[PDB]
């Protein structure tokens, strides 16, 4: 039943990588452009995501097996899954009491109306908050939450991957660690693995709807100029 | 001796354009990334210049004759003279008492050491502060200061200009307005016009030294990512 020494070392490396790339106090948020309550919240949220992308890359470089991939596969995996990984780690700040992301006082409390002040319609915000509620109800352990992000990041079905045979080999080896951990250390999780895999397909729909609204913004220069060079590079179509 | 009706209307349009694109209170400075005392002041200064570029473009669009030029000449004139026009309008905040730009409290007071925290050596900062002192000693009127920026912007000797015959026609017509205004409304300015033209050649050396240090930064992505999409476009080499 129990895990092996090499499977637990994968857990020791992912949890440590997440602690090194996530701040539960959100102290670096003051270095962003201030939030403003056309598209007033766009500068603050653009810095918030650009800051998150830097942390996702730091977390990716510490995933066992990710660094041995080619530099092109690392880019294709990061570009197509960046917004999905960000939506996963954003649940750590989401709260079911106010139905919003809480990162500080009234300034860093991102309600549903605040994201509307960035150009996003309710066609994406309605399933996104629905995703945060369903994910928050799972009460995932810290090991399970960091495993879901590594599995979502190592997906072979990403546009631009080349050696997708090794990518599937790394993802399935990451899936076996999660599937076994729930059987051993998570009581009442006889159906948890299927619910987490279901959340991956939900992120694909959130990724698709996000890319349509971002594409509409990227063509208008008076709005895309408020973005950061990293966001334009990750969410861009260059290859 | 006196001016004509069409020459004074050029003055009424430039002074109004400068008032519409400059804030003596510097209230929009809080919307930038906060200043931090490797390259800690780079995010704040990158937003400060990107904000200034937007105001220089607004001031350029209200210069009489600039809007009738081709869209390509307007870009070639703005790109090659942006840092020069910015250094001109920056004198409005410079103070000889502390030898620094004063835009607010201790946060928006940009000393010489603060610009060093952006990657700039003293090879550019030493002549730049020397330029601000010599320009501040001239005690230029508001009409003379706005005329110097329009003359600096309409320079024909810019890399990338095409119809430089009309550009020289507009600059010399702008020079005659300045040369006559000093003779009429500025007592003790028998030598002022030559001193202002001398400051234009000084800006060319400041422009050259600025482009060398920016070029060294632009090749390092970990630093150029802290810039804005507008700064990368104006200070870039694309054509």
């Amino acid at each position: 039943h129990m895990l092996s020494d090499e499977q637990m070392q994968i857990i020791n490396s992912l949890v440590e990588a997440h602690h090194k790339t996530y701040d539960d106090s959100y102290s670096d948020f003051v270095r962003f452009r201030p939030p403003v309550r056309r598209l007033s919240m766009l500068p603050h949220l653009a810095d918030l995501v650009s800051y998150s992308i830097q942390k996702v890359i730091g977390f990716a470089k510490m995933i066992p097996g990710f660094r041995d991939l080619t530099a092109e596969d690392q880019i294709a995996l990061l570009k197509s899954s960046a917004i999905e990984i960000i939506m996963l780690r954003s649940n750590q700040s989401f709260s079911l009491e106010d139905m919003s992301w809480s990162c500080g006082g009234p300034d860093f409390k991102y309600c549903i109306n605040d994201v509307t002040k960035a150009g996003h319609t309710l066609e994406l915000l309605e399933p996104l908050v629905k995703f945060q509620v369903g994910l928050k109800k799972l009460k995932l352990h810290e090991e399970e939450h960091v495993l879901l992000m590594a599995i979502c990041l190592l997906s072979p079905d990403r546009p631009g991957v080349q050696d997708h045979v090794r990518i599937e080999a790394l993802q399935d080896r990451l899936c076996d660690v999660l599937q076994a951990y729930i059987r051993i250390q998570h009581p009442g999780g006889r159906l948890l693995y299927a619910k987490m895999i279901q959340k991956l397909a939900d992120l694909r729909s959130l990724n698709e709807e996000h890319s349509k609204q971002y594409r509409s913004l990227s063509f208008q220069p008076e709005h895309s100029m408020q973005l950061t060079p990293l966001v334009l590079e990750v969410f861009g179509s260059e290859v | 001796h006196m001016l004509s009706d069409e020459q004074m209307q050029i003055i009424n349009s430039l002074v109004e354009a400068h008032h519409k694109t400059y804030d003596d209170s510097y209230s929009d400075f809080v919307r930038f990334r906060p200043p931090v005392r490797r390259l800690s002041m780079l995010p704040h200064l990158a937003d400060l210049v990107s904000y200034s570029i937007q105001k220089v473009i607004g001031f350029a669009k209200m210069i009489p004759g600039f809007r009738d030029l081709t869209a390509e000449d307007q870009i070639a004139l703005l790109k090659s003279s942006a840092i020069e026009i910015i250094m001109l309008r920056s004198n409005q905040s410079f103070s000889l008492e502390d030898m620094s730009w004063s835009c607010g409290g201790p946060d928006f007071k940009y000393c010489i050491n603060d610009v060093t925290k952006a990657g700039h050596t003293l090879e550019l900062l030493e002549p730049l502060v020397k330029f601000q002192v010599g320009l501040k000693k001239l005690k230029l009127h508001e009409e003379e200061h706005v005329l110097l920026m329009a003359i600096c912007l309409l320079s024909p000797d810019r890399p990338g200009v095409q119809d430089h015959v009309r550009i020289e026609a507009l600059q010399d017509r702008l020079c005659d307005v300045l040369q006559a205004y000093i003779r009429i409304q500025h007592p003790g300015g028998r030598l002022l016009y030559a001193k202002m033209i001398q400051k234009l050649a000084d800006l060319r050396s400041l422009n050259e030294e600025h482009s060398k240090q920016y070029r060294s930064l632009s090749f390092q992505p970990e630093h150029s990512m802290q810039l804005t999409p507008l700064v990368l476009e104006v200070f870039g080499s694309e054509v």
């Binding site: 890359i57 470089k61 530099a71 690392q74 880019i75 990750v234 290859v239 | 992505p221 970990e222 150029s224």
Partner: peptide
């Protein structure tokens, strides 16, 4: 292309 991503990947 992707000059920042290459650098951010060390």
């Amino acid at each position: 292309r992707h000059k920042i991503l290459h650098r951010l990947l060390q």
